[PDB]
Structures are given as structure tokens and as C-alpha cells.
């Protein structure tokens, strides 16, 4: 009668894929699912990330309204805003991507700083790469992602990019990463 499977997590619209070695792109339209996001201001991206991490982990750690102690972790992504001067604008918005099972029913935000917001309507270019990533690698991948998207009508708004990883990598913990550019 009803047909479902175990492999289903984020239905999105991928238009195509096809980049370069290491930096490979995919332009896709977002699920539109509800995610847990925290935005930090006043504090630089360095501080904002480390300050937002507690806020993300406290949510899945048990400080959620449903009292879920299931610490579920998939790659976490945060938006950064680079100015044309090369300097990042001090505003950082962390998006915590919720696993599919919890998309159907996510716990309510019991912390005022973390909000469950749904994001749809926009198209992103995502580059998936593997290896030991440092903070510079995210920037470099964004740089190369722009370089690879060169010659296309792809424009970006605020040149915003998102950096995805399971943890903030210093060296070994951060082997799978994503960088998302949003088309203007």
C-alpha cells in the first residue's frame, strides 16, 4: 500500500553536478526543512563559531523541550559573510542540519538563542571534499568554487558561503566538509 525505504533523508533538487578534482560542485535547491540555527553577532567568526557550538550541542544534548538525550550529529554548517575587502563581516549564523528521522518531529528549542527555522527557496552550490580541512581550506574551497563556477550566470548574494563539518577541525576531526555558496 504505502512504499517507503530506509534510504531517504533530504529530498532536494539537484540540477547537475560536475566540477574539478578535490573541489566538486552540485547546484541544488534546499529541502526546506526545519533546522536549528543560532546567529552570533559582535563576536568575530572565530569567537562566534566557538560560542555557537555550545548552543548547538546543548540542544541535542538534552536542553531541548522534548528532553531528547539522543545526541544526533550530522555535518553542521555555518554561514559566513565575506566582504569584497576580503574581510569577513562579523555575523555568523550556524545552521544545524537535523537528521531525517528528526525532521518529521524535532524537539522544540528550550534555549532562546537556538531557533528552529525552515529554509527553502534558495539554490546553493555545494562542494563536497575530503581530507583534513583547516579553516583556510573552507575559504580556499569557496575561492576555488567561485573559480570553477566561472563562466556561468551564477552570482552570489553577499558572497556568503557556508562551512559544513561535524566539528571545527584543528587537524584530524574534519575529514568530510561542505562549502555552500548561495546564488544571488
mmCIF file with all atom_site columns, C-alpha atoms in Angstrom:
data_model
loop_
_atom_site.group_PDB
_atom_site.id
_atom_site.type_symbol
_atom_site.label_atom_id
_atom_site.label_alt_id
_atom_site.label_comp_id
_atom_site.label_asym_id
_atom_site.label_entity_id
_atom_site.label_seq_id
_atom_site.pdbx_PDB_ins_code
_atom_site.Cartn_x
_atom_site.Cartn_y
_atom_site.Cartn_z
_atom_site.occupancy
_atom_site.B_iso_or_equiv
_atom_site.pdbx_formal_charge
_atom_site.auth_seq_id
_atom_site.auth_comp_id
_atom_site.auth_asym_id
_atom_site.auth_atom_id
_atom_site.pdbx_PDB_model_num
ATOM 1   C CA . UNK A 1 1   ? 0.000  0.000  0.000   1.00 0.00 ? 1   UNK A CA 1
ATOM 2   C CA . UNK A 1 2   ? 2.467  2.563  1.175   1.00 0.00 ? 2   UNK A CA 1
ATOM 3   C CA . UNK A 1 3   ? 6.001  2.244  -0.024  1.00 0.00 ? 3   UNK A CA 1
ATOM 4   C CA . UNK A 1 4   ? 8.900  3.634  1.940   1.00 0.00 ? 4   UNK A CA 1
ATOM 5   C CA . UNK A 1 5   ? 12.506 2.744  2.482   1.00 0.00 ? 5   UNK A CA 1
ATOM 6   C CA . UNK A 1 6   ? 15.402 3.272  4.809   1.00 0.00 ? 6   UNK A CA 1
ATOM 7   C CA . UNK A 1 7   ? 17.349 5.444  2.422   1.00 0.00 ? 7   UNK A CA 1
ATOM 8   C CA . UNK A 1 8   ? 15.631 8.805  2.414   1.00 0.00 ? 8   UNK A CA 1
ATOM 9   C CA . UNK A 1 9   ? 16.956 11.778 4.210   1.00 0.00 ? 9   UNK A CA 1
ATOM 10  C CA . UNK A 1 10  ? 16.870 15.114 2.323   1.00 0.00 ? 10  UNK A CA 1
ATOM 11  C CA . UNK A 1 11  ? 14.878 15.385 -0.869  1.00 0.00 ? 11  UNK A CA 1
ATOM 12  C CA . UNK A 1 12  ? 16.216 18.328 -2.734  1.00 0.00 ? 12  UNK A CA 1
ATOM 13  C CA . UNK A 1 13  ? 16.501 19.302 -6.307  1.00 0.00 ? 13  UNK A CA 1
ATOM 14  C CA . UNK A 1 14  ? 19.919 18.804 -7.762  1.00 0.00 ? 14  UNK A CA 1
ATOM 15  C CA . UNK A 1 15  ? 20.241 20.427 -11.127 1.00 0.00 ? 15  UNK A CA 1
ATOM 16  C CA . UNK A 1 16  ? 23.559 18.859 -12.065 1.00 0.00 ? 16  UNK A CA 1
ATOM 17  C CA . UNK A 1 17  ? 26.971 18.060 -10.677 1.00 0.00 ? 17  UNK A CA 1
ATOM 18  C CA . UNK A 1 18  ? 30.387 18.345 -12.220 1.00 0.00 ? 18  UNK A CA 1
ATOM 19  C CA . UNK A 1 19  ? 33.382 20.178 -11.008 1.00 0.00 ? 19  UNK A CA 1
ATOM 20  C CA . UNK A 1 20  ? 37.044 19.526 -10.570 1.00 0.00 ? 20  UNK A CA 1
ATOM 21  C CA . UNK A 1 21  ? 39.170 17.164 -8.601  1.00 0.00 ? 21  UNK A CA 1
ATOM 22  C CA . UNK A 1 22  ? 39.020 17.960 -4.871  1.00 0.00 ? 22  UNK A CA 1
ATOM 23  C CA . UNK A 1 23  ? 36.561 20.768 -5.425  1.00 0.00 ? 23  UNK A CA 1
ATOM 24  C CA . UNK A 1 24  ? 33.432 19.297 -6.944  1.00 0.00 ? 24  UNK A CA 1
ATOM 25  C CA . UNK A 1 25  ? 30.132 21.136 -7.192  1.00 0.00 ? 25  UNK A CA 1
ATOM 26  C CA . UNK A 1 26  ? 26.483 20.441 -7.139  1.00 0.00 ? 26  UNK A CA 1
ATOM 27  C CA . UNK A 1 27  ? 23.802 23.043 -7.560  1.00 0.00 ? 27  UNK A CA 1
ATOM 28  C CA . UNK A 1 28  ? 20.762 22.140 -5.700  1.00 0.00 ? 28  UNK A CA 1
ATOM 29  C CA . UNK A 1 29  ? 17.625 23.649 -4.243  1.00 0.00 ? 29  UNK A CA 1
ATOM 30  C CA . UNK A 1 30  ? 17.206 23.267 -0.495  1.00 0.00 ? 30  UNK A CA 1
ATOM 31  C CA . UNK A 1 31  ? 14.867 20.712 1.234   1.00 0.00 ? 31  UNK A CA 1
ATOM 32  C CA . UNK A 1 32  ? 13.052 23.444 3.039   1.00 0.00 ? 32  UNK A CA 1
ATOM 33  C CA . UNK A 1 33  ? 13.212 21.523 6.232   1.00 0.00 ? 33  UNK A CA 1
ATOM 34  C CA . UNK A 1 34  ? 13.273 22.988 9.657   1.00 0.00 ? 34  UNK A CA 1
ATOM 35  C CA . UNK A 1 35  ? 16.730 23.335 11.166  1.00 0.00 ? 35  UNK A CA 1
ATOM 36  C CA . UNK A 1 36  ? 18.221 24.663 14.371  1.00 0.00 ? 36  UNK A CA 1
ATOM 37  C CA . UNK A 1 37  ? 20.062 27.832 13.808  1.00 0.00 ? 37  UNK A CA 1
ATOM 38  C CA . UNK A 1 38  ? 21.991 30.218 16.040  1.00 0.00 ? 38  UNK A CA 1
ATOM 39  C CA . UNK A 1 39  ? 23.248 33.600 14.956  1.00 0.00 ? 39  UNK A CA 1
ATOM 40  C CA . UNK A 1 40  ? 26.010 35.349 16.784  1.00 0.00 ? 40  UNK A CA 1
ATOM 41  C CA . UNK A 1 41  ? 26.970 38.986 16.472  1.00 0.00 ? 41  UNK A CA 1
ATOM 42  C CA . UNK A 1 42  ? 29.581 41.412 17.993  1.00 0.00 ? 42  UNK A CA 1
ATOM 43  C CA . UNK A 1 43  ? 31.883 38.483 18.258  1.00 0.00 ? 43  UNK A CA 1
ATOM 44  C CA . UNK A 1 44  ? 34.128 37.655 15.199  1.00 0.00 ? 44  UNK A CA 1
ATOM 45  C CA . UNK A 1 45  ? 33.665 34.373 13.220  1.00 0.00 ? 45  UNK A CA 1
ATOM 46  C CA . UNK A 1 46  ? 36.438 32.807 15.389  1.00 0.00 ? 46  UNK A CA 1
ATOM 47  C CA . UNK A 1 47  ? 34.512 33.589 18.561  1.00 0.00 ? 47  UNK A CA 1
ATOM 48  C CA . UNK A 1 48  ? 31.048 33.253 17.086  1.00 0.00 ? 48  UNK A CA 1
ATOM 49  C CA . UNK A 1 49  ? 31.655 29.687 15.987  1.00 0.00 ? 49  UNK A CA 1
ATOM 50  C CA . UNK A 1 50  ? 33.058 28.556 19.340  1.00 0.00 ? 50  UNK A CA 1
ATOM 51  C CA . UNK A 1 51  ? 30.285 30.360 21.166  1.00 0.00 ? 51  UNK A CA 1
ATOM 52  C CA . UNK A 1 52  ? 27.574 28.896 18.901  1.00 0.00 ? 52  UNK A CA 1
ATOM 53  C CA . UNK A 1 53  ? 28.915 25.301 19.163  1.00 0.00 ? 53  UNK A CA 1
ATOM 54  C CA . UNK A 1 54  ? 27.764 25.027 22.905  1.00 0.00 ? 54  UNK A CA 1
ATOM 55  C CA . UNK A 1 55  ? 24.363 26.284 21.774  1.00 0.00 ? 55  UNK A CA 1
ATOM 56  C CA . UNK A 1 56  ? 24.083 23.597 19.135  1.00 0.00 ? 56  UNK A CA 1
ATOM 57  C CA . UNK A 1 57  ? 25.367 20.780 21.359  1.00 0.00 ? 57  UNK A CA 1
ATOM 58  C CA . UNK A 1 58  ? 23.153 21.798 24.297  1.00 0.00 ? 58  UNK A CA 1
ATOM 59  C CA . UNK A 1 59  ? 20.144 21.342 22.020  1.00 0.00 ? 59  UNK A CA 1
ATOM 60  C CA . UNK A 1 60  ? 20.863 17.711 21.110  1.00 0.00 ? 60  UNK A CA 1
ATOM 61  C CA . UNK A 1 61  ? 22.480 17.134 24.478  1.00 0.00 ? 61  UNK A CA 1
ATOM 62  C CA . UNK A 1 62  ? 19.202 17.334 26.295  1.00 0.00 ? 62  UNK A CA 1
ATOM 63  C CA . UNK A 1 63  ? 18.444 21.037 26.743  1.00 0.00 ? 63  UNK A CA 1
ATOM 64  C CA . UNK A 1 64  ? 15.658 20.662 24.190  1.00 0.00 ? 64  UNK A CA 1
ATOM 65  C CA . UNK A 1 65  ? 11.985 20.929 25.156  1.00 0.00 ? 65  UNK A CA 1
ATOM 66  C CA . UNK A 1 66  ? 11.163 17.309 24.374  1.00 0.00 ? 66  UNK A CA 1
ATOM 67  C CA . UNK A 1 67  ? 14.007 16.221 26.644  1.00 0.00 ? 67  UNK A CA 1
ATOM 68  C CA . UNK A 1 68  ? 15.643 14.173 23.963  1.00 0.00 ? 68  UNK A CA 1
ATOM 69  C CA . UNK A 1 69  ? 19.038 12.936 25.072  1.00 0.00 ? 69  UNK A CA 1
ATOM 70  C CA . UNK A 1 70  ? 19.809 11.495 21.673  1.00 0.00 ? 70  UNK A CA 1
ATOM 71  C CA . UNK A 1 71  ? 22.820 13.435 20.607  1.00 0.00 ? 71  UNK A CA 1
ATOM 72  C CA . UNK A 1 72  ? 22.421 13.159 16.895  1.00 0.00 ? 72  UNK A CA 1
ATOM 73  C CA . UNK A 1 73  ? 25.149 14.646 14.823  1.00 0.00 ? 73  UNK A CA 1
ATOM 74  C CA . UNK A 1 74  ? 25.380 15.091 11.067  1.00 0.00 ? 74  UNK A CA 1
ATOM 75  C CA . UNK A 1 75  ? 27.603 17.809 9.443   1.00 0.00 ? 75  UNK A CA 1
ATOM 76  C CA . UNK A 1 76  ? 26.869 21.227 10.856  1.00 0.00 ? 76  UNK A CA 1
ATOM 77  C CA . UNK A 1 77  ? 27.062 24.248 8.640   1.00 0.00 ? 77  UNK A CA 1
ATOM 78  C CA . UNK A 1 78  ? 27.515 27.906 9.387   1.00 0.00 ? 78  UNK A CA 1
ATOM 79  C CA . UNK A 1 79  ? 27.119 30.934 7.224   1.00 0.00 ? 79  UNK A CA 1
ATOM 80  C CA . UNK A 1 80  ? 29.839 33.490 6.963   1.00 0.00 ? 80  UNK A CA 1
ATOM 81  C CA . UNK A 1 81  ? 29.753 36.737 5.057   1.00 0.00 ? 81  UNK A CA 1
ATOM 82  C CA . UNK A 1 82  ? 32.910 37.794 3.240   1.00 0.00 ? 82  UNK A CA 1
ATOM 83  C CA . UNK A 1 83  ? 33.238 41.389 2.124   1.00 0.00 ? 83  UNK A CA 1
ATOM 84  C CA . UNK A 1 84  ? 34.884 42.312 -1.150  1.00 0.00 ? 84  UNK A CA 1
ATOM 85  C CA . UNK A 1 85  ? 37.698 43.736 1.025   1.00 0.00 ? 85  UNK A CA 1
ATOM 86  C CA . UNK A 1 86  ? 38.480 40.114 1.913   1.00 0.00 ? 86  UNK A CA 1
ATOM 87  C CA . UNK A 1 87  ? 37.406 40.573 5.475   1.00 0.00 ? 87  UNK A CA 1
ATOM 88  C CA . UNK A 1 88  ? 34.537 38.601 6.955   1.00 0.00 ? 88  UNK A CA 1
ATOM 89  C CA . UNK A 1 89  ? 31.622 40.611 8.239   1.00 0.00 ? 89  UNK A CA 1
ATOM 90  C CA . UNK A 1 90  ? 31.140 39.890 11.919  1.00 0.00 ? 90  UNK A CA 1
ATOM 91  C CA . UNK A 1 91  ? 27.920 37.959 11.812  1.00 0.00 ? 91  UNK A CA 1
ATOM 92  C CA . UNK A 1 92  ? 27.811 34.245 11.908  1.00 0.00 ? 92  UNK A CA 1
ATOM 93  C CA . UNK A 1 93  ? 24.780 32.099 11.604  1.00 0.00 ? 93  UNK A CA 1
ATOM 94  C CA . UNK A 1 94  ? 25.070 28.422 12.413  1.00 0.00 ? 94  UNK A CA 1
ATOM 95  C CA . UNK A 1 95  ? 22.630 26.067 10.871  1.00 0.00 ? 95  UNK A CA 1
ATOM 96  C CA . UNK A 1 96  ? 22.257 22.711 12.428  1.00 0.00 ? 96  UNK A CA 1
ATOM 97  C CA . UNK A 1 97  ? 21.015 20.275 9.979   1.00 0.00 ? 97  UNK A CA 1
ATOM 98  C CA . UNK A 1 98  ? 18.631 17.904 11.589  1.00 0.00 ? 98  UNK A CA 1
ATOM 99  C CA . UNK A 1 99  ? 18.665 14.194 10.550  1.00 0.00 ? 99  UNK A CA 1
ATOM 100 C CA . UNK A 1 100 ? 15.657 12.913 8.565   1.00 0.00 ? 100 UNK A CA 1
ATOM 101 C CA . UNK A 1 101 ? 14.071 10.989 11.404  1.00 0.00 ? 101 UNK A CA 1
ATOM 102 C CA . UNK A 1 102 ? 14.081 14.128 13.455  1.00 0.00 ? 102 UNK A CA 1
ATOM 103 C CA . UNK A 1 103 ? 12.859 16.246 10.526  1.00 0.00 ? 103 UNK A CA 1
ATOM 104 C CA . UNK A 1 104 ? 9.486  14.568 10.918  1.00 0.00 ? 104 UNK A CA 1
ATOM 105 C CA . UNK A 1 105 ? 9.370  15.613 14.549  1.00 0.00 ? 105 UNK A CA 1
ATOM 106 C CA . UNK A 1 106 ? 12.160 17.767 16.010  1.00 0.00 ? 106 UNK A CA 1
ATOM 107 C CA . UNK A 1 107 ? 12.330 18.849 19.683  1.00 0.00 ? 107 UNK A CA 1
ATOM 108 C CA . UNK A 1 108 ? 11.349 22.434 20.420  1.00 0.00 ? 108 UNK A CA 1
ATOM 109 C CA . UNK A 1 109 ? 14.104 24.936 21.244  1.00 0.00 ? 109 UNK A CA 1
ATOM 110 C CA . UNK A 1 110 ? 14.205 25.333 25.018  1.00 0.00 ? 110 UNK A CA 1
ATOM 111 C CA . UNK A 1 111 ? 17.142 27.722 24.683  1.00 0.00 ? 111 UNK A CA 1
ATOM 112 C CA . UNK A 1 112 ? 16.305 31.213 23.457  1.00 0.00 ? 112 UNK A CA 1
ATOM 113 C CA . UNK A 1 113 ? 19.374 31.529 21.291  1.00 0.00 ? 113 UNK A CA 1
ATOM 114 C CA . UNK A 1 114 ? 18.688 28.460 19.224  1.00 0.00 ? 114 UNK A CA 1
ATOM 115 C CA . UNK A 1 115 ? 15.751 28.660 16.868  1.00 0.00 ? 115 UNK A CA 1
ATOM 116 C CA . UNK A 1 116 ? 14.171 26.096 14.636  1.00 0.00 ? 116 UNK A CA 1
ATOM 117 C CA . UNK A 1 117 ? 13.837 27.760 11.272  1.00 0.00 ? 117 UNK A CA 1
ATOM 118 C CA . UNK A 1 118 ? 12.975 26.279 7.975   1.00 0.00 ? 118 UNK A CA 1
ATOM 119 C CA . UNK A 1 119 ? 14.916 27.373 4.957   1.00 0.00 ? 119 UNK A CA 1
ATOM 120 C CA . UNK A 1 120 ? 13.728 26.921 1.407   1.00 0.00 ? 120 UNK A CA 1
ATOM 121 C CA . UNK A 1 121 ? 13.539 28.881 -1.765  1.00 0.00 ? 121 UNK A CA 1
ATOM 122 C CA . UNK A 1 122 ? 17.196 29.189 -2.496  1.00 0.00 ? 122 UNK A CA 1
ATOM 123 C CA . UNK A 1 123 ? 19.709 27.444 -4.594  1.00 0.00 ? 123 UNK A CA 1
ATOM 124 C CA . UNK A 1 124 ? 23.101 26.563 -3.350  1.00 0.00 ? 124 UNK A CA 1
ATOM 125 C CA . UNK A 1 125 ? 26.241 25.323 -4.835  1.00 0.00 ? 125 UNK A CA 1
ATOM 126 C CA . UNK A 1 126 ? 27.774 22.819 -2.656  1.00 0.00 ? 126 UNK A CA 1
ATOM 127 C CA . UNK A 1 127 ? 31.179 21.455 -2.870  1.00 0.00 ? 127 UNK A CA 1
ATOM 128 C CA . UNK A 1 128 ? 31.928 18.190 -1.172  1.00 0.00 ? 128 UNK A CA 1
ATOM 129 C CA . UNK A 1 129 ? 35.538 17.439 -0.484  1.00 0.00 ? 129 UNK A CA 1
ATOM 130 C CA . UNK A 1 130 ? 37.518 15.066 1.655   1.00 0.00 ? 130 UNK A CA 1
ATOM 131 C CA . UNK A 1 131 ? 40.709 15.344 3.596   1.00 0.00 ? 131 UNK A CA 1
ATOM 132 C CA . UNK A 1 132 ? 41.998 17.098 6.666   1.00 0.00 ? 132 UNK A CA 1
ATOM 133 C CA . UNK A 1 133 ? 40.418 20.513 6.499   1.00 0.00 ? 133 UNK A CA 1
ATOM 134 C CA . UNK A 1 134 ? 41.562 23.580 8.309   1.00 0.00 ? 134 UNK A CA 1
ATOM 135 C CA . UNK A 1 135 ? 39.726 26.911 8.418   1.00 0.00 ? 135 UNK A CA 1
ATOM 136 C CA . UNK A 1 136 ? 41.731 28.166 5.425   1.00 0.00 ? 136 UNK A CA 1
ATOM 137 C CA . UNK A 1 137 ? 40.535 25.148 3.417   1.00 0.00 ? 137 UNK A CA 1
ATOM 138 C CA . UNK A 1 138 ? 36.957 26.333 3.666   1.00 0.00 ? 138 UNK A CA 1
ATOM 139 C CA . UNK A 1 139 ? 37.957 29.726 2.341   1.00 0.00 ? 139 UNK A CA 1
ATOM 140 C CA . UNK A 1 140 ? 40.150 28.171 -0.342  1.00 0.00 ? 140 UNK A CA 1
ATOM 141 C CA . UNK A 1 141 ? 37.325 25.864 -1.397  1.00 0.00 ? 141 UNK A CA 1
ATOM 142 C CA . UNK A 1 142 ? 34.972 28.819 -1.608  1.00 0.00 ? 142 UNK A CA 1
ATOM 143 C CA . UNK A 1 143 ? 37.585 30.642 -3.657  1.00 0.00 ? 143 UNK A CA 1
ATOM 144 C CA . UNK A 1 144 ? 38.018 27.668 -5.968  1.00 0.00 ? 144 UNK A CA 1
ATOM 145 C CA . UNK A 1 145 ? 34.291 27.060 -6.054  1.00 0.00 ? 145 UNK A CA 1
ATOM 146 C CA . UNK A 1 146 ? 33.925 30.557 -7.471  1.00 0.00 ? 146 UNK A CA 1
ATOM 147 C CA . UNK A 1 147 ? 36.794 29.863 -9.802  1.00 0.00 ? 147 UNK A CA 1
ATOM 148 C CA . UNK A 1 148 ? 35.172 26.658 -11.019 1.00 0.00 ? 148 UNK A CA 1
ATOM 149 C CA . UNK A 1 149 ? 31.700 28.352 -11.342 1.00 0.00 ? 149 UNK A CA 1
ATOM 150 C CA . UNK A 1 150 ? 33.431 30.937 -13.522 1.00 0.00 ? 150 UNK A CA 1
ATOM 151 C CA . UNK A 1 151 ? 31.807 31.337 -16.912 1.00 0.00 ? 151 UNK A CA 1
ATOM 152 C CA . UNK A 1 152 ? 28.321 30.666 -15.689 1.00 0.00 ? 152 UNK A CA 1
ATOM 153 C CA . UNK A 1 153 ? 25.380 33.007 -14.768 1.00 0.00 ? 153 UNK A CA 1
ATOM 154 C CA . UNK A 1 154 ? 25.982 32.020 -11.145 1.00 0.00 ? 154 UNK A CA 1
ATOM 155 C CA . UNK A 1 155 ? 26.093 35.058 -8.941  1.00 0.00 ? 155 UNK A CA 1
ATOM 156 C CA . UNK A 1 156 ? 26.127 35.148 -5.201  1.00 0.00 ? 156 UNK A CA 1
ATOM 157 C CA . UNK A 1 157 ? 24.480 37.324 -2.617  1.00 0.00 ? 157 UNK A CA 1
ATOM 158 C CA . UNK A 1 158 ? 26.857 38.780 -0.082  1.00 0.00 ? 158 UNK A CA 1
ATOM 159 C CA . UNK A 1 159 ? 29.304 36.155 -1.449  1.00 0.00 ? 159 UNK A CA 1
ATOM 160 C CA . UNK A 1 160 ? 28.030 34.129 1.512   1.00 0.00 ? 160 UNK A CA 1
ATOM 161 C CA . UNK A 1 161 ? 29.361 30.694 1.988   1.00 0.00 ? 161 UNK A CA 1
ATOM 162 C CA . UNK A 1 162 ? 28.570 28.034 4.444   1.00 0.00 ? 162 UNK A CA 1
ATOM 163 C CA . UNK A 1 163 ? 31.095 25.821 6.022   1.00 0.00 ? 163 UNK A CA 1
ATOM 164 C CA . UNK A 1 164 ? 29.997 22.353 6.956   1.00 0.00 ? 164 UNK A CA 1
ATOM 165 C CA . UNK A 1 165 ? 31.769 19.892 9.115   1.00 0.00 ? 165 UNK A CA 1
ATOM 166 C CA . UNK A 1 166 ? 30.937 17.727 12.070  1.00 0.00 ? 166 UNK A CA 1
ATOM 167 C CA . UNK A 1 167 ? 33.297 19.666 14.312  1.00 0.00 ? 167 UNK A CA 1
ATOM 168 C CA . UNK A 1 168 ? 35.534 22.741 13.996  1.00 0.00 ? 168 UNK A CA 1
ATOM 169 C CA . UNK A 1 169 ? 38.641 20.962 12.618  1.00 0.00 ? 169 UNK A CA 1
ATOM 170 C CA . UNK A 1 170 ? 42.044 21.655 14.000  1.00 0.00 ? 170 UNK A CA 1
ATOM 171 C CA . UNK A 1 171 ? 43.620 18.671 12.192  1.00 0.00 ? 171 UNK A CA 1
ATOM 172 C CA . UNK A 1 172 ? 42.086 15.076 12.358  1.00 0.00 ? 172 UNK A CA 1
ATOM 173 C CA . UNK A 1 173 ? 38.424 15.780 13.119  1.00 0.00 ? 173 UNK A CA 1
ATOM 174 C CA . UNK A 1 174 ? 37.127 17.320 9.993   1.00 0.00 ? 174 UNK A CA 1
ATOM 175 C CA . UNK A 1 175 ? 37.616 14.974 7.138   1.00 0.00 ? 175 UNK A CA 1
ATOM 176 C CA . UNK A 1 176 ? 34.281 15.496 5.464   1.00 0.00 ? 176 UNK A CA 1
ATOM 177 C CA . UNK A 1 177 ? 33.295 19.030 4.729   1.00 0.00 ? 177 UNK A CA 1
ATOM 178 C CA . UNK A 1 178 ? 30.953 21.032 2.555   1.00 0.00 ? 178 UNK A CA 1
ATOM 179 C CA . UNK A 1 179 ? 31.031 24.594 1.340   1.00 0.00 ? 179 UNK A CA 1
ATOM 180 C CA . UNK A 1 180 ? 27.766 26.058 0.139   1.00 0.00 ? 180 UNK A CA 1
ATOM 181 C CA . UNK A 1 181 ? 27.575 29.191 -1.993  1.00 0.00 ? 181 UNK A CA 1
ATOM 182 C CA . UNK A 1 182 ? 24.161 30.691 -2.486  1.00 0.00 ? 182 UNK A CA 1
ATOM 183 C CA . UNK A 1 183 ? 23.188 32.099 -5.849  1.00 0.00 ? 183 UNK A CA 1
ATOM 184 C CA . UNK A 1 184 ? 22.167 35.739 -5.537  1.00 0.00 ? 184 UNK A CA 1
#
